[PDB]
Design an enzyme around this catalytic site. Structure first.
Site, PDB file in Angstrom:
ATOM      1  N   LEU A  95      42.723  21.304  36.296  1.00 22.02           N
ATOM      2  CA  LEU A  95      41.578  20.705  36.977  1.00 22.02           C
ATOM      3  C   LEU A  95      40.270  21.464  36.756  1.00 22.02           C
ATOM      4  O   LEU A  95      39.243  21.082  37.308  1.00 22.02           O
ATOM      5  CB  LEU A  95      41.869  20.558  38.473  1.00 22.02           C
ATOM      6  CG  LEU A  95      43.108  19.720  38.812  1.00 22.02           C
ATOM      7  CD1 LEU A  95      43.275  19.641  40.318  1.00 22.02           C
ATOM      8  CD2 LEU A  95      43.034  18.322  38.218  1.00 22.02           C
ATOM      9  N   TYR A 112      39.218  40.463  35.586  1.00 24.11           N
ATOM     10  CA  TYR A 112      39.357  39.324  34.675  1.00 24.11           C
ATOM     11  C   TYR A 112      39.386  39.778  33.218  1.00 24.11           C
ATOM     12  O   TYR A 112      40.213  39.318  32.435  1.00 24.11           O
ATOM     13  CB  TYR A 112      38.208  38.333  34.878  1.00 24.11           C
ATOM     14  CG  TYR A 112      37.999  37.379  33.720  1.00 24.11           C
ATOM     15  CD1 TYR A 112      37.180  37.727  32.644  1.00 24.11           C
ATOM     16  CD2 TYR A 112      38.612  36.128  33.702  1.00 24.11           C
ATOM     17  CE1 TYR A 112      36.984  36.859  31.583  1.00 24.11           C
ATOM     18  CE2 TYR A 112      38.416  35.251  32.648  1.00 24.11           C
ATOM     19  CZ  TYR A 112      37.604  35.624  31.591  1.00 24.11           C
ATOM     20  OH  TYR A 112      37.413  34.759  30.542  1.00 24.11           O
ATOM     21  N   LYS A 157      42.483  39.957  30.202  1.00 16.96           N
ATOM     22  CA  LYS A 157      42.329  39.249  28.923  1.00 16.96           C
ATOM     23  C   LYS A 157      42.710  40.143  27.748  1.00 16.96           C
ATOM     24  O   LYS A 157      43.305  39.672  26.781  1.00 16.96           O
ATOM     25  CB  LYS A 157      40.903  38.716  28.754  1.00 16.96           C
ATOM     26  CG  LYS A 157      40.546  37.614  29.738  1.00 16.96           C
ATOM     27  CD  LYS A 157      41.235  36.295  29.418  1.00 16.96           C
ATOM     28  CE  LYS A 157      41.345  35.424  30.656  1.00 16.96           C
ATOM     29  NZ  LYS A 157      41.856  34.069  30.330  1.00 16.96           N
TER      30      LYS A 157
HETATM   31  N1  LIG Z   1      34.326  28.376  31.740  1.00 20.09           N
HETATM   32  C1  LIG Z   1      33.982  29.017  30.622  1.00 20.09           C
HETATM   33  O1  LIG Z   1      32.920  28.788  30.070  1.00 20.09           O
HETATM   34  C2  LIG Z   1      34.899  30.045  30.023  1.00 20.09           C
HETATM   35  C3  LIG Z   1      34.372  31.141  29.339  1.00 20.09           C
HETATM   36  C4  LIG Z   1      35.244  32.076  28.794  1.00 20.09           C
HETATM   37  C5  LIG Z   1      36.619  31.891  28.945  1.00 20.09           C
HETATM   38  N2  LIG Z   1      37.110  30.831  29.603  1.00 20.09           N
HETATM   39  C6  LIG Z   1      38.574  30.704  29.732  1.00 20.09           C
HETATM   40  O2  LIG Z   1      38.995  29.336  29.734  1.00 20.09           O
HETATM   41  C7  LIG Z   1      40.076  29.149  30.654  1.00 20.09           C
HETATM   42  C8  LIG Z   1      39.957  27.813  31.382  1.00 20.09           C
HETATM   43  O3  LIG Z   1      38.615  27.552  31.786  1.00 20.09           O
HETATM   44  P1  LIG Z   1      38.318  26.491  32.962  1.00 20.09           P
HETATM   45  O4  LIG Z   1      36.814  26.396  33.093  1.00 20.09           O
HETATM   46  O5  LIG Z   1      39.154  25.247  32.724  1.00 20.09           O
HETATM   47  O6  LIG Z   1      38.914  27.280  34.237  1.00 20.09           O
HETATM   48  P2  LIG Z   1      38.323  27.135  35.730  1.00 20.09           P
HETATM   49  O7  LIG Z   1      37.838  28.488  36.196  1.00 20.09           O
HETATM   50  O8  LIG Z   1      37.401  25.942  35.802  1.00 20.09           O
HETATM   51  O9  LIG Z   1      39.640  26.752  36.559  1.00 20.09           O
HETATM   52  C9  LIG Z   1      40.646  27.725  36.791  1.00 20.09           C
HETATM   53  C10 LIG Z   1      41.879  27.002  37.302  1.00 20.09           C
HETATM   54  O10 LIG Z   1      42.904  27.943  37.622  1.00 20.09           O
HETATM   55  C11 LIG Z   1      43.631  27.377  38.707  1.00 20.09           C
HETATM   56  N3  LIG Z   1      44.505  28.363  39.376  1.00 20.09           N
HETATM   57  C12 LIG Z   1      44.139  29.451  40.080  1.00 20.09           C
HETATM   58  N4  LIG Z   1      45.238  30.102  40.546  1.00 20.09           N
HETATM   59  C13 LIG Z   1      46.321  29.420  40.127  1.00 20.09           C
HETATM   60  C14 LIG Z   1      47.789  29.541  40.256  1.00 20.09           C
HETATM   61  N5  LIG Z   1      48.326  30.568  40.949  1.00 20.09           N
HETATM   62  N6  LIG Z   1      48.567  28.599  39.666  1.00 20.09           N
HETATM   63  C15 LIG Z   1      48.042  27.570  38.970  1.00 20.09           C
HETATM   64  N7  LIG Z   1      46.716  27.401  38.819  1.00 20.09           N
HETATM   65  C16 LIG Z   1      45.829  28.272  39.362  1.00 20.09           C
HETATM   66  C17 LIG Z   1      42.554  26.802  39.611  1.00 20.09           C
HETATM   67  O11 LIG Z   1      43.048  25.837  40.543  1.00 20.09           O
HETATM   68  C18 LIG Z   1      41.606  26.210  38.582  1.00 20.09           C
HETATM   69  O12 LIG Z   1      41.850  24.810  38.385  1.00 20.09           O
HETATM   70  C19 LIG Z   1      40.072  30.334  31.610  1.00 20.09           C
HETATM   71  O13 LIG Z   1      41.382  30.909  31.703  1.00 20.09           O
HETATM   72  C20 LIG Z   1      39.057  31.315  31.047  1.00 20.09           C
HETATM   73  O14 LIG Z   1      39.632  32.614  30.853  1.00 20.09           O
HETATM   74  C21 LIG Z   1      36.284  29.914  30.139  1.00 20.09           C
END
Ligand SMILES: NC(=O)c1ccc[n+]([C@@H]2O[C@H](COP(=O)([O-])OP(=O)(O)OC[C@H]3O[C@@H](n4cnc5c(N)ncnc54)[C@H](O)[C@@H]3O)[C@@H](O)[C@H]2O)c1
Ligand SMILES: NC(=O)c1ccc[n+]([C@@H]2O[C@H](COP(=O)([O-])OP(=O)(O)OC[C@H]3O[C@@H](n4cnc5c(N)ncnc54)[C@H](O)[C@@H]3O)[C@@H](O)[C@H]2O)c1
Lengths: 206, 215
Positions: A10, A122, A126
């Protein structure tokens, strides 16, 4: 045709990633998952499932019962979101990985996990995602595949989701390494699998 | 005078360090601990306790009940056995470590953890040992102090006596004199920052290594 389970679905990327793979492998072959409640539309997109990453047995039930081959792992506590609740961040990121590697190594599942470009729980997890992921490739057969996302909207979202799709389609023979740097605006990423950023500075404004 | 908890003490270094510190700070100031039955002599050397690192609760008790100010974390699965038992090695090296950090940071303990010089879950966790402990030094005031042990000779090498003394020294140092938390530590080969900052000088170069070993 593979069977997908998207963890942390989500989020910003997970929903988009889902609807890409759905129009590729079919509606019923991509299972979206989170702990938070899905909006009205994203529920109806295709099979959604509550899946807690810290619950190891949840994952197994799901990966066996739903015959999963591909697993995308987006669930993680964001930097600032986790700096206020460190224990949580550490658990969800590091224990969550551990549970994800075990489920995948055990049940022969292709595992995608994104990394990034440490002073932050975080960031520490990673580094740990990469080193652990590389270890489970050596120690067991785990088809672990990871690419260091940079800034996402630096790079555009449609490049980020397609980079993730392609690197999983490719054969394991043409992957010299398991962690790739993916850059828009990374030679190995461009050489091993045909990577090319579509959205650069000018056409990103359109 | 600090009160010492050693963790995973019935290993190679643990008994040596224990015996070193007990001469320094006093006998009943240094509690030794492990999950194995300690030999007859080491048990009576001074306070011995069953300490399972996979029980967070167990550690807190120990730390509070004995007012542990210093903690030396030697409990580990070295790769050799850990490569077979990945699950058990993972937990002990990582979740185990986590518990130590937390107990330390909570009750404001000085924490020593050793590292080494990555294709083994032992190594991967030692990278983790370092990146966490330093993060915990910034995120909270955790006085985390880590040496990177090289090859440790007993009976890029180092005789045990240097290893132990180096650890006592890096913990006795003023927090004021430490530019960084993880320090290389070197003797021979056949560590600028360590010597620069807290005056590390290895008394067992090669000649005297061979001299001692033959007894
Ligand atoms: N948003 C960015 O621009 C960006 C930048 C660098 C890296 N990333 C990487 O991309 C990945 C995904 O990005 P995103 O924007 O879809 O993530 P997000 O931060 O929008 O969502 C994180 C999700 O993790 C879920 N979550 C938390 N604890 C949980 C648990 N115990 N079990 C199951 N789910 C759980 C939350 O409900 C949430 O839906 C991340 O792991 C991140 O490391 C994203
Ligand atoms: N001596 C070397 O060659 C060397 C080199 C580099 C780093 N090191 C580091 O030094 C430290 C100590 O080395 P060592 O020679 O004593 O190793 P060792 O194998 O002799 O001792 C490890 C100890 O950990 C204990 N242990 C296992 N599980 C435990 C648990 N759940 N709770 C508490 N204790 C547990 C074991 O009983 C054992 O006595 C290690 O952490 C290692 O990373 C050693």
């Amino acid at each position: 045709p593979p069977r997908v389970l998207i963890t942390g679905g989500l989020g910003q990327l997970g929903v988009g990633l889902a609807n890409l793979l759905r129009k590729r492998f079919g509606k019923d072959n991509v299972i979206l998952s989170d702990i938070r409640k899905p909006p009205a539309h994203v529920f109806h997109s295709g099979p959604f499932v509550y899946a807690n990453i810290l619950d190891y047995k949840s994952l197994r039930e799901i990966v066996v019962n739903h015959r999963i081959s591909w697993l995308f792992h987006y669930s993680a506590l964001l930097s600032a979101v986790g700096e206020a609740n460190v224990s949580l961040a550490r658990d969800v990121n590091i224990t969550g990985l551990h549970n994800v590697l075990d489920v995948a190594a055990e049940y022969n599942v292709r595992l995608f996990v994104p990394s990034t470009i440490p002073r932050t729980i975080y960031g520490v997890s990673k580094v740990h995602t990469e080193l652990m992921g590389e270890y489970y490739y050596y120690r067991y057969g785990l088809d672990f595949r990871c690419l260091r996302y940079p800034g996402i909207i630096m790079m555009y979202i449609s490049d980020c989701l397609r980079a993730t799709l392609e690197v999983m389609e490719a054969p394991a023979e043409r992957l010299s390494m398991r962690t790739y740097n993916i850059s828009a605006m990374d030679s190995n990423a461009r050489k091993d699998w045909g990577w090319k950023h579509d959205f650069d500075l000018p056409e990103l404004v359109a």
